[PDB]
Amino acid sequence: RNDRTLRRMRKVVNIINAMEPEMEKLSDEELKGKTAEFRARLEKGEVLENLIPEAFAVVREASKRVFGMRHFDVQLLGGMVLNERCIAEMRTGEGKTLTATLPAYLNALTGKGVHVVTVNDYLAQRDAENNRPLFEFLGLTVGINLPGMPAPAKREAYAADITYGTNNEYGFDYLRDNMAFSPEERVQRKLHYALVDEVDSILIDEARTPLIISGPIQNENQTLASITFQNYFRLYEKLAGMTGTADTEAFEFSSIYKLDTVVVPTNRPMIRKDLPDLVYMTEAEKIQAIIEDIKERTAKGQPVLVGTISIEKSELVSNELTKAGIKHNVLNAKFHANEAAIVAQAGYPAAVTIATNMAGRGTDIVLGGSWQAEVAALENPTAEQIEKIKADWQVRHDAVLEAGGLHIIGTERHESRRIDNQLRGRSGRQGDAGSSRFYLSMEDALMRIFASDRVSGMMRKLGMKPGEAIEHPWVTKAIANAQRKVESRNFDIRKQLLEYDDVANDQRRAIYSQRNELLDVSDVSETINSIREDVFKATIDAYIPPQSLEEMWDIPGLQERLKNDFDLDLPIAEWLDKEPELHEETLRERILAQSIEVYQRKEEVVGAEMMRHFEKGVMLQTLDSLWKEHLAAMDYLRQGIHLRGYAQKDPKQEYKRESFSMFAAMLESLKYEVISTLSKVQVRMP
Amino acid sequence: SRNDRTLRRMRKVVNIINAMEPEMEKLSDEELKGKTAEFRARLEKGEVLENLIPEAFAVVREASKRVFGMRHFDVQLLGGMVLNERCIAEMRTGEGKTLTATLPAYLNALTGKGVHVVTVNDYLAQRDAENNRPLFEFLGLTVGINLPGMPAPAKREAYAADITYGTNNEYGFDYLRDNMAFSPEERVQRKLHYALVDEVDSILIDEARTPLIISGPAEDSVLIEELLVKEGIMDEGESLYSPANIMLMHHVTAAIQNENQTLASITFQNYFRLYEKLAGMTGTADTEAFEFSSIYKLDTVVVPTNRPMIRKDLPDLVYMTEAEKIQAIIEDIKERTAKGQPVLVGTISIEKSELVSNELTKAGIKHNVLNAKFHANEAAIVAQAGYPAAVTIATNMAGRGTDIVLGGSWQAEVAALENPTAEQIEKIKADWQVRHDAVLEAGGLHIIGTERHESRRIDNQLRGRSGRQGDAGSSRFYLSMEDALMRIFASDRVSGMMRKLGMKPGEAIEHPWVTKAIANAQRKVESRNFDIRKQLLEYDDVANDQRRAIYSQRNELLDVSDVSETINSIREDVFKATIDAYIPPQSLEEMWDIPGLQERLKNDFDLDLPIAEWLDKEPELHEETLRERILAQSIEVYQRKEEVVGAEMMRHFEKGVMLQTLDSLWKEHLAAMDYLRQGIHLRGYAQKDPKQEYKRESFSMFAAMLESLKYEVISTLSKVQVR
């Protein structure tokens, strides 16, 4: 794995670097033309991966010219990771959005499309509009998909070389496409490449979330179509994504998706100092130590950001900082404008900011303050007002760097380390000096994830002693270990649930493959003919046990069932009693033959083409109704998973059997109902 | 007349202040600073504060010029003069409230009694304090800041400054804790002189009845007939359901280490009514003038805008169905965005934001939704919201918010540049001025309210985001017969008469009365809801009255070094009534109960005076002379304790006893009233006025508690042990 495929990638980066001179010499129009050239080579059978060096050099030069921005080498590496079935972990500040332009371009060349998957519609629109000038420079088109967009505009978006949209809207389009009655109605093309912008939410937290299209004595209403996010993304030929050195869930990615994760090295060395966790007997002693840390550091001019787990915890450290005479600001979620004013100068010398359940990624904190806010505040910004301001700011920035950068204090750990990782990640971005320290007490909720009141209370025998602490780095490890076992416990449970999910996934995958085979064809004849014989054979068998005497036959039952279910009223009793020659095999053939002549007759009235399309129609409609019905029954079967499979024998397993049985039965019903409808369809006969 | 007549006399004063501007310009920084001492000299000689307004305002306006580079506008002078009276200054968003407020703050600081600028939160307190501190120091005044957790000496410094900034909450809590002090030097506040409240909608109206509570563990240690019989403390003929036995009853409604109790309580409404002067500000966010006047006796003056307010507030429109409303909304947005006008759409819910947003996309219309989950996206959106043909959807958009700058802010574009130069900015700024002017000429910012709120204040807040500082602008509210709003006309039939004024497919008309009917309905809802609230304030006035009386008493104690004569007075009071019980005034010697008297005396006062044995050696002395001597003995046993302890110690012990007994009986009372108030949710009946009976029982227990305060003080001072 590893730096084993990373050192192979570094070799390609040195080829890209070595090519910059060639690219710098090309005209704007020659750069555009590289796209057609790459496509001409692919046409001739070139392997996409062979184009990475030249293609990435093109994209980097186009970005130089268009954006004023040149991918760094580690940006090239990330782009290479994202071409593979991988998660590329790239630290916050590393420029993920720019990095992503690379495998987007690369994977657009074969003419099959690219789906960049964003967390919300604002980002989809933004990233598409921002990148559109880059990709147009290189002779590519950019599409945007939004909820509510009419189907023709959706088709256009999906017909672009690169599409932007949310996870939700891609998934719903897929479902709606598998409710279409003609292939022209579809909006998406074949699912080629999904590049997922933040995989933690999109791929992990939402993995099992169902997308559902719902629809109609009451009427009441019900599921017509369903798929989970996981099973949606599993449909792509190529799948990849990005997240920050966050992750903690590499094993999940692989288990849920067969996505490998790759640590992309930072552009600059990471130098933030993550100091050992500190543990106190009580909250009160914990708070005093936090206050004492703040005090020492603000006196050196170092700014501090404190993350807490609640408003009540935020109030408490505030009030205690005030008692101690230390100025600060609390980020109050009620006051968004105050909050952005505070965050802007959070990197200012000796600044102290308290934040509550600090979200994830966050607004960049500029060391020394943002000078940019300073001019945005000017009534009439000159250019030389804006120089005294940078010069003053430089001194501040460099002084804060000197004092150790941003210090992060976690006043509690969260049960998930990924959240702790996000808080800490707000310091030390882009090579910046920084530090972090997390605080625990024995009356912290988290001192519970060691499932034992004796265990944890031994820490009290280390005594702690009010300001006379030591640091025991084994504690840091011990806590990270406890947090990894919680994640693991939780995932073993999720995994069992996904193994139930895999039954419905396989069923849907089967039914949808069948539906689409039907949708893609103009003429469903061979199938019709073919299931008619199955249906008639099955139907006759119910009344004529195969290879049985005539005395076992229920001909009145067979006569009625043909009338009732097939509109087919045959003098079978009179047939038998007239020719002693008959026999089962020839009877079976007469009936089949008559159903046919009667059907061919209806066709002669309406016309072949009308008939063919009615047949297709009927197949699709009957498939859909039995599938909605199956989805509901699968639901009930699954919630009933507390009384059918028990003593020794596995549930999962009995459920798999019942499921298989019910899906088999559904496919046999499907055949029956189609032929029943087609046999019964009333045509006014001349 | 009313507001017109105030504004006229105030405009005359503005003309005076403006005439003074050249004197003030010619003054040195130091001469300006000296103006404060010169106003103070005059006030000390009997000048009336309001006579100082013209000179004072001129001085602050000149100093703001030198210090901030900001010169108060004439409308800002007017609002400053409104704020000197018991009034709310309604000043539109974008009018510079925060600068206006320096004026009455300066002036109300001159008598040396303090100013409490009240802010909504601690960020604003600190920020305002720090931003004004150079202005007020330039004028020889000090500025303090009060925050939760600040130590008491620091608090005292803040309250001792000429002007203080802090939140409502912290002012109140400080008041409560000052009334738990056992010496006057422990107090952090001064006498409550002037409170200038920065946003009165939230602080004065929404939070009027919010109680501030100090709690401390600081407490100490047919059905009925069954319970009533057995045990005692009530034992003879009293009724467990009496107010009196309320706590006992609670123990049996209740029936093991501590619990905790209210030690002190005030509502915001009652805290701000303690000030000698109260004033505040809010945006054209009125509708609540009657409430301010009702609850606080604050009058409201609508201050005019610096530039003419030309926003066009267009007639409400009413559609049959929600779906018909939404289509009209989309076509409005369409015609407007095609002329280059930007639009802001305010909705009441997320789902309502998604429906409009989704139909905008079905219509081909680019927009942004303000998604409450992505606040960084949201502030990027608000930035370009005044850009040409921009469309933004906001959900329950709160009061006030950020100025949307027509054209975008050019200054923001430039704050992207790592390296601006002169002709760059210039490109940016001139490019902007073209967009800005094009947006003005397309009609400025249009506001669509897709539904009206039950509260009109809120709709006015929304509409108020357009037409700031004289920009062109417009607003249109949309309604449906389906709208939750067409409901609070409390008849279904008396709404339905626009089935039959029945709004046809393509076309349109307009009705002035519909707009006025809707407004008038929102106004009946408001007055209906304030009727209910006034009832609750009536309950609150019972507590306020009692707490005002007991804290007045507590403070008189706190403020006196020697309480002797209060003690001497109440001891006679107490001994007189205690003896009355057994000896009916002027009664025959045979009208007298001693097996009952002697006992109480020993039991309640450690006073054991073999009484009938006197009256056996002296058959002659008579009732006044014996009342005289019982008093005398109690006094005598007391002075000996005092010559053991020393007058100083004894005097201060008496005061501590009074204070501590008062606080104890007071806390008991607060808890018993709490119970009565919720006992009086269903202690009984759709019937005999529940309120009223609670007022009576509460005032009766209050009166009772005043008499126990005496008795228990004297009993404590009688029984105290010195060896």
Side-chain angles (χ1 to χ4, degrees):
Chain A
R1 218 92 308 172
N2 270 210
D3 235 282
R4 212 44 272 191
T5 55
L6 280 171
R7 72 188 101 269
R8 170 179 63 68
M9 295 184 173
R10 298 222 80 115
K11 283 212 156 217
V12 178
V13 156
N14 282 323
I15 298 166
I16 294 161
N17 284 339
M19 267 175 196
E20 188 153 29
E22 201 207 4
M23 293 305 143
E24 288 172 333
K25 297 219 88 231
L26 273 34
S27 74
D28 287 8
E29 224 349 283
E30 299 181 287
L31 281 171
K32 190 156 184 192
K34 292 288 184 199
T35 310
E37 182 182 343
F38 301 146
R39 286 189 160 150
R41 299 157 67 170
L42 291 170
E43 195 298 284
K44 304 212 63 162
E46 182 64 283
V47 177
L48 186 65
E49 289 67 34
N50 279 335
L51 301 189
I52 283 172
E54 287 183 80
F56 278 26
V58 173
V59 181
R60 157 137 102 180
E61 189 58 24
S63 182
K64 272 233 293 276
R65 282 177 200 198
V66 174
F67 295 154
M69 293 171 220
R70 206 188 80 115
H71 307 65
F72 306 131
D73 293 5
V74 286
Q75 293 178 303
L76 304 172
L77 295 185
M80 291 177 213
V81 167
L82 291 171
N83 186 47
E84 309 291 321
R85 187 179 193 86
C86 284
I87 305 300
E89 278 216 279
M90 303 186 294
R91 260 226 84 199
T92 315
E94 291 298 286
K96 291 194 270 300
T97 297
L98 187 55
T99 298
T101 57
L102 297 163
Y105 180 80
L106 199 76
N107 287 276
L109 296 172
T110 57
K112 309 293 170 167
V114 173
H115 294 177
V116 183
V117 194
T118 70
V119 298
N120 64 57
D121 293 332
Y122 167 73
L123 295 172
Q125 310 183 253
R126 197 198 59 186
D127 298 358
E129 289 306 326
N130 281 347
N131 287 348
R132 193 176 301 275
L134 168 69
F135 290 125
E136 278 168 38
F137 189 98
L138 296 171
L140 296 183
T141 60
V142 173
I144 164 79
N145 188 31
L146 301 165
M149 180 177 274
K154 287 182 165 274
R155 287 200 196 89
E156 276 168 22
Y158 283 103
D161 282 296
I162 304 179
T163 305
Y164 295 83
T166 48
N167 61 332
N168 257 265
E169 196 62 10
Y170 288 132
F172 290 120
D173 284 330
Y174 179 79
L175 291 185
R176 279 187 299 262
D177 277 6
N178 283 285
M179 292 170 91
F181 275 71
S182 62
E184 298 75 23
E185 288 156 32
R186 289 188 184 118
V187 305
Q188 306 188 308
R189 343 179 216 162
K190 174 170 259 263
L191 301 173
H192 173 234
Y193 177 50
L195 171 54
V196 182
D197 280 352
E198 304 188 11
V199 297
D200 285 341
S201 69
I202 289 176
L203 290 202
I204 295 313
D205 307 337
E206 303 298 334
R208 293 188 63 242
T209 302
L211 297 183
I212 278 161
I213 286 120
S214 250
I217 325 90
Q218 279 52 297
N219 189 335
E220 287 166 13
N221 98 138
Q222 60 157 221
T223 301
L224 316 178
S226 198
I227 196 169
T228 59
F229 278 112
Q230 174 207 16
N231 287 318
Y232 177 70
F233 290 109
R234 290 213 285 183
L235 291 165
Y236 287 79
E237 162 187 354
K238 295 188 74 181
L239 178 64
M242 294 180 293
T243 193
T245 333
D247 132 81
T248 53
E249 302 145 302
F251 68 117
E252 297 173 19
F253 284 116
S254 206
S255 163
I256 302 175
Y257 293 102
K258 315 312 144 327
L259 282 162
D260 289 336
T261 128
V262 173
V263 198
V264 192
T266 42
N267 181 44
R268 321 287 186 93
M270 273 291 327
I271 59 165
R272 184 183 60 246
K273 294 170 180 191
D274 294 327
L275 308 171
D277 291 7
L278 288 174
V279 192
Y280 297 84
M281 289 274 278
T282 52
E283 260 276 351
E285 305 159 320
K286 177 170 85 171
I287 300 309
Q288 277 316 101
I290 283 165
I291 308 301
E292 259 319 294
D293 189 10
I294 297 182
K295 160 132 150 296
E296 336 203 83
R297 291 178 187 274
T298 50
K300 295 190 166 202
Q302 180 175 28
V304 186
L305 171 63
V306 189
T308 73
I309 93 283
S310 66
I311 288 159
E312 325 84 49
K313 295 293 171 218
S314 290
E315 289 167 8
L316 168 58
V317 47
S318 188
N319 297 6
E320 276 297 319
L321 277 172
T322 298
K323 176 182 188 184
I326 297 172
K327 309 187 149 220
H328 61 276
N329 296 110
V330 182
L331 296 168
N332 195 329
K334 293 209 271 263
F335 298 109
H336 285 192
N338 301 356
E339 282 183 305
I342 295 166
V343 171
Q345 310 306 341
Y348 196 93
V352 183
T353 307
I354 313 309
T356 296
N357 305 317
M358 269 250 95
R361 86 225 338 97
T363 290
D364 256 26
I365 293 175
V366 179
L367 302 179
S370 31
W371 62 275
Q372 292 203 141
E374 275 169 280
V375 329
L378 294 166
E379 249 286 30
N380 210 26
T382 80
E384 192 36 44
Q385 288 183 142
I386 305 176
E387 274 313 27
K388 168 85 195 116
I389 274 169
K390 301 256 222 66
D392 296 9
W393 167 91
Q394 200 60 53
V395 183
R396 292 190 318 266
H397 176 263
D398 286 13
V400 170
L401 280 178
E402 256 301 294
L406 192 60
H407 183 66
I408 299 294
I409 292 173
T411 64
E412 285 90 19
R413 288 193 178 271
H414 278 99
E415 210 184 25
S416 177
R417 208 183 181 75
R418 158 181 137 202
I419 308 172
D420 287 347
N421 286 348
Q422 282 169 13
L423 174 62
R424 178 183 82 174
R426 290 169 151 62
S427 172
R429 287 170 178 183
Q430 298 163 4
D432 282 357
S435 50
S436 80
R437 179 88 80 167
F438 288 84
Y439 292 77
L440 295 102
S441 87
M442 304 303 325
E443 31 160 331
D444 265 19
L446 199 150
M447 285 275 135
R448 273 204 153 252
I449 64 166
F450 316 103
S452 190
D453 268 20
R454 245 223 158 278
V455 176
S456 315
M458 191 57 67
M459 297 264 212
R460 314 174 194 288
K461 292 285 289 202
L462 265 49
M464 299 112 173
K465 289 241 87 304
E468 215 199 52
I470 256 158
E471 287 186 355
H472 281 106
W474 70 262
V475 175
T476 298
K477 283 203 231 209
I479 284 157
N481 187 192
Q483 279 177 314
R484 111 185 108 270
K485 296 218 177 268
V486 179
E487 255 276 49
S488 260
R489 267 181 266 300
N490 287 189
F491 197 60
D492 297 359
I493 285 164
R494 249 207 144 184
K495 191 118 68 56
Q496 288 311 98
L497 290 172
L498 304 161
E499 298 165 23
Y500 288 86
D501 285 7
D502 279 1
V503 190
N505 179 52
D506 291 339
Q507 290 187 350
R508 190 212 77 249
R509 209 171 188 107
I511 207 60
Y512 283 16
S513 166
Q514 177 170 166
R515 192 183 194 281
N516 284 316
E517 270 151 31
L518 294 176
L519 205 58
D520 289 320
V521 114
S522 291
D523 193 297
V524 88
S525 273
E526 187 249 324
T527 299
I528 290 314
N529 288 337
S530 190
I531 71 186
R532 179 190 313 265
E533 297 164 322
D534 308 332
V535 160
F536 279 108
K537 177 196 199 308
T539 301
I540 301 158
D541 284 0
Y543 299 97
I544 303 180
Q547 283 155 239
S548 64
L549 291 188
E550 296 224 303
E551 125 190 311
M552 322 297 159
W553 309 358
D554 177 32
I555 299 303
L558 179 57
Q559 265 175 188
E560 280 27 287
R561 184 92 159 235
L562 294 177
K563 277 174 87 332
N564 296 358
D565 286 22
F566 300 96
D567 198 340
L568 202 65
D569 186 29
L570 308 195
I572 303 163
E574 325 191 69
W575 286 350
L576 288 193
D577 108 78
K578 284 162 209 312
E579 47 270 39
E581 283 167 349
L582 212 353
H583 105 283
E584 192 177 355
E585 208 158 60
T586 30
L587 216 189
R588 281 170 163 177
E589 283 149 8
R590 271 235 273 286
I591 298 160
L592 184 63
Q594 259 83 153
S595 71
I596 283 168
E597 301 158 13
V598 173
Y599 184 69
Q600 291 180 163
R601 171 181 324 148
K602 291 185 187 152
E603 181 163 340
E604 289 170 37
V605 171
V606 88
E609 247 193 326
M610 203 57 151
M611 259 297 186
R612 295 300 77 79
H613 280 270
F614 179 73
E615 282 179 345
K616 211 209 175 165
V618 174
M619 290 205 68
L620 284 174
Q621 193 175 237
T622 311
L623 187 155
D624 297 346
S625 311
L626 297 163
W627 186 236
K628 73 197 54 144
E629 182 190 303
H630 185 83
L631 285 184
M634 284 296 281
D635 216 297
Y636 305 145
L637 178 58
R638 201 172 162 165
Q639 83 209 12
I641 229 74
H642 308 103
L643 251 215
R644 325 187 105 138
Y646 50 112
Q648 298 298 28
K649 263 87 165 335
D650 202 2
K652 222 184 73 333
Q653 226 46 47
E654 188 47 50
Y655 171 80
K656 291 191 282 196
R657 292 209 83 223
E658 287 155 352
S659 277
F660 178 88
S661 294
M662 174 205 306
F663 190 85
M666 180 197 70
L667 297 163
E668 276 356 74
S669 291
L670 185 42
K671 290 188 192 177
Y672 196 91
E673 297 296 318
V674 159
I675 301 291
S676 190
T677 297
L678 292 179
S679 302
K680 291 181 91 199
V681 72
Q682 303 234 312
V683 178
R684 169 253 309 124
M685 298 284 72
Chain B
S1 337
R2 201 45 196 166
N3 250 36
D4 61 315
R5 218 32 92 117
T6 305
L7 282 180
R8 281 202 293 285
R9 146 180 80 74
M10 287 184 303
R11 293 269 195 200
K12 289 176 105 113
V13 183
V14 166
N15 282 337
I16 299 170
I17 294 156
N18 283 346
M20 293 172 170
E21 178 162 34
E23 282 176 46
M24 296 317 159
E25 294 179 345
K26 273 108 91 108
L27 261 24
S28 74
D29 286 5
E30 203 51 26
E31 282 164 328
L32 277 168
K33 179 175 304 207
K35 291 296 223 194
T36 301
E38 172 185 319
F39 296 140
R40 290 184 154 167
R42 298 173 55 184
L43 285 172
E44 279 289 353
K45 288 170 188 122
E47 186 63 266
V48 163
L49 179 71
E50 293 49 56
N51 282 338
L52 302 183
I53 274 156
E55 256 206 279
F57 282 22
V59 164
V60 175
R61 171 191 256 171
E62 180 67 14
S64 187
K65 281 176 59 189
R66 297 179 186 198
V67 178
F68 295 154
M70 286 157 83
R71 184 187 176 275
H72 301 67
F73 299 129
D74 282 3
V75 297
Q76 289 186 302
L77 299 185
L78 301 171
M81 299 174 206
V82 176
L83 296 171
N84 187 50
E85 295 284 324
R86 202 184 174 81
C87 296
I88 300 302
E90 181 170 48
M91 292 180 292
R92 220 301 243 10
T93 296
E95 292 302 299
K97 289 186 286 306
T98 302
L99 194 67
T100 295
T102 54
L103 301 164
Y106 181 79
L107 183 79
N108 285 281
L110 297 173
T111 58
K113 298 297 179 216
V115 177
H116 296 167
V117 185
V118 191
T119 71
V120 299
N121 62 47
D122 285 336
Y123 173 66
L124 294 173
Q126 286 189 93
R127 190 197 68 171
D128 294 358
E130 283 320 322
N131 289 347
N132 296 345
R133 180 190 312 283
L135 174 73
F136 300 125
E137 288 179 347
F138 185 105
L139 292 172
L141 296 182
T142 52
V143 168
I145 167 78
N146 185 27
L147 297 170
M150 191 171 274
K155 296 177 155 281
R156 276 186 214 101
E157 279 187 14
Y159 279 96
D162 295 287
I163 304 164
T164 309
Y165 292 90
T167 58
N168 57 340
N169 267 246
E170 199 64 14
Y171 290 131
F173 282 123
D174 277 334
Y175 180 79
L176 299 180
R177 284 186 293 257
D178 278 4
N179 287 281
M180 295 166 65
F182 276 74
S183 69
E185 29 283 324
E186 296 165 15
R187 291 183 181 123
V188 300
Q189 317 189 305
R190 281 196 273 176
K191 174 183 207 328
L192 298 176
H193 173 225
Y194 180 48
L196 173 53
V197 170
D198 273 354
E199 301 200 338
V200 296
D201 283 358
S202 49
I203 287 172
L204 292 193
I205 299 294
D206 298 345
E207 280 289 308
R209 298 201 50 240
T210 305
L212 305 176
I213 292 171
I214 299 166
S215 333
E219 351 93 38
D220 35 308
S221 182
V222 188
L223 302 173
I224 226 319
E225 202 293 72
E226 249 284 19
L227 298 37
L228 221 100
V229 67
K230 94 192 74 277
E231 310 309 326
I233 176 114
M234 172 205 75
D235 31 337
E236 208 181 50
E238 217 204 310
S239 165
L240 183 91
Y241 353 74
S242 55
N245 300 8
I246 169 72
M247 297 307 303
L248 214 186
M249 166 84 138
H250 197 75
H251 281 290
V252 355
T253 69
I256 317 187
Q257 269 106 33
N258 217 223
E259 97 212 294
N260 65 96
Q261 74 173 359
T262 310
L263 317 173
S265 193
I266 204 169
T267 63
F268 285 110
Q269 174 225 354
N270 288 318
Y271 176 65
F272 289 111
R273 299 189 301 166
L274 295 165
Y275 280 81
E276 181 197 325
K277 291 190 74 181
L278 182 57
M281 303 182 294
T282 187
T284 327
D286 68 53
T287 68
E288 298 161 300
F290 71 118
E291 294 186 25
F292 287 122
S293 179
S294 181
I295 304 177
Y296 293 100
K297 301 282 172 306
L298 289 158
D299 287 351
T300 139
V301 184
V302 188
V303 177
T305 50
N306 177 45
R307 304 208 193 203
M309 206 298 294
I310 58 162
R311 188 189 62 251
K312 294 184 190 156
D313 293 322
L314 301 177
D316 297 10
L317 302 167
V318 184
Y319 297 82
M320 203 42 167
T321 61
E322 252 273 33
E324 294 165 340
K325 180 176 35 155
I326 296 304
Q327 204 78 327
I329 290 160
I330 299 305
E331 170 70 33
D332 192 0
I333 296 179
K334 195 168 98 107
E335 299 163 339
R336 285 193 189 273
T337 50
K339 295 179 143 209
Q341 187 176 24
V343 182
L344 174 78
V345 185
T347 65
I348 68 219
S349 77
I350 264 78
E351 307 71 10
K352 259 68 161 99
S353 303
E354 324 193 355
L355 185 53
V356 66
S357 161
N358 276 43
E359 287 298 315
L360 282 177
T361 307
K362 164 172 181 172
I365 311 160
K366 325 260 148 197
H367 56 281
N368 298 108
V369 177
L370 284 181
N371 192 313
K373 281 197 169 159
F374 306 96
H375 299 178
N377 302 354
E378 292 192 309
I381 296 164
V382 166
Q384 307 202 53
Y387 196 107
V391 182
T392 308
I393 320 314
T395 296
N396 281 310
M397 220 207 170
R400 167 54 47 86
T402 321
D403 221 271
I404 298 189
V405 177
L406 300 188
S409 72
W410 65 273
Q411 307 103 141
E413 279 157 72
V414 10
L417 263 133
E418 343 312 315
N419 275 125
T421 195
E423 52 57 280
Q424 275 198 162
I425 308 277
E426 281 19 290
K427 221 293 168 185
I428 284 184
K429 189 212 229 289
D431 287 325
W432 171 84
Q433 185 62 51
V434 180
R435 296 195 298 270
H436 179 269
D437 290 339
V439 172
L440 287 175
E441 172 103 342
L445 188 57
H446 188 61
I447 306 306
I448 301 172
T450 64
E451 281 94 5
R452 285 197 166 273
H453 281 78
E454 217 175 36
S455 179
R456 193 148 179 128
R457 182 215 293 175
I458 291 183
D459 295 344
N460 296 339
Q461 284 168 347
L462 184 67
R463 102 180 157 183
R465 303 190 176 287
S466 167
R468 293 173 179 185
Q469 293 173 0
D471 293 344
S474 60
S475 80
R476 174 90 75 173
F477 297 78
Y478 286 81
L479 294 96
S480 224
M481 303 305 276
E482 313 179 20
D483 278 6
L485 213 92
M486 224 90 188
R487 199 268 137 111
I488 62 159
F489 307 92
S491 192
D492 269 12
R493 259 217 66 117
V494 191
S495 256
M497 217 46 59
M498 288 212 76
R499 320 252 62 65
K500 226 100 179 298
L501 277 101
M503 318 97 154
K504 253 199 71 173
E507 318 146 347
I509 274 176
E510 298 201 325
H511 292 292
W513 76 266
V514 173
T515 296
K516 277 179 332 254
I518 292 156
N520 185 218
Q522 286 170 308
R523 147 158 28 90
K524 298 181 162 304
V525 168
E526 188 48 80
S527 69
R528 211 253 149 290
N529 287 167
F530 193 52
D531 288 351
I532 298 206
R533 192 167 215 204
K534 262 212 286 216
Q535 282 301 103
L536 298 162
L537 297 164
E538 262 187 69
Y539 284 86
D540 295 357
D541 284 358
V542 179
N544 186 46
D545 283 352
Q546 306 180 10
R547 180 207 87 256
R548 256 216 135 110
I550 204 76
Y551 280 9
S552 171
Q553 182 170 350
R554 206 181 183 279
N555 290 133
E556 280 184 38
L557 294 180
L558 215 41
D559 290 335
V560 86
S561 257
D562 183 339
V563 134
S564 306
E565 164 200 280
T566 294
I567 301 295
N568 292 322
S569 157
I570 82 200
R571 187 199 344 257
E572 314 160 77
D573 290 342
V574 171
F575 268 50
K576 187 200 169 317
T578 304
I579 297 165
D580 283 358
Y582 301 96
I583 298 177
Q586 300 306 295
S587 230
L588 283 78
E589 179 153 301
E590 307 105 293
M591 288 268 321
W592 295 7
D593 173 16
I594 336 90
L597 160 19
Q598 33 146 137
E599 324 296 10
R600 200 170 145 179
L601 262 178
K602 296 165 205 150
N603 284 8
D604 286 337
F605 301 106
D606 288 356
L607 215 68
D608 182 352
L609 291 22
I611 297 157
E613 113 173 330
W614 318 151
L615 306 216
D616 262 56
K617 260 264 64 84
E618 51 250 278
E620 51 86 63
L621 77 168
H622 304 150
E623 202 206 286
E624 175 31 42
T625 89
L626 74 97
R627 281 170 175 267
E628 256 171 337
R629 292 145 83 186
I630 285 180
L631 180 68
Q633 271 282 177
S634 87
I635 296 179
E636 89 176 38
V637 186
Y638 190 76
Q639 297 166 120
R640 278 113 72 165
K641 289 181 194 182
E642 176 169 5
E643 80 207 33
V644 180
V645 152
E648 280 303 278
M649 215 41 97
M650 193 69 229
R651 299 290 84 66
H652 289 256
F653 177 73
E654 285 171 335
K655 172 160 151 186
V657 169
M658 291 206 75
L659 289 166
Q660 180 171 223
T661 318
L662 178 165
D663 286 341
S664 287
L665 285 165
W666 180 240
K667 288 177 315 186
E668 197 177 6
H669 186 66
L670 264 7
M673 291 317 98
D674 234 281
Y675 291 153
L676 265 190
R677 270 193 85 173
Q678 71 196 246
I680 280 62
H681 274 125
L682 225 89
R683 274 251 274 203
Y685 277 102
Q687 240 249 31
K688 268 147 163 150
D689 200 345
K691 117 155 167 312
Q692 284 335 335
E693 182 68 49
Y694 153 75
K695 292 162 165 209
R696 288 198 286 279
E697 295 162 334
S698 173
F699 276 123
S700 164
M701 291 180 34
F702 181 73
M705 179 195 75
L706 302 165
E707 288 325 313
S708 306
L709 172 54
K710 299 188 199 230
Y711 192 72
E712 304 242 278
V713 164
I714 292 318
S715 178
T716 292
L717 296 177
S718 297
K719 285 160 150 34
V720 64
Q721 186 66 352
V722 328
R723 81 222 51 113

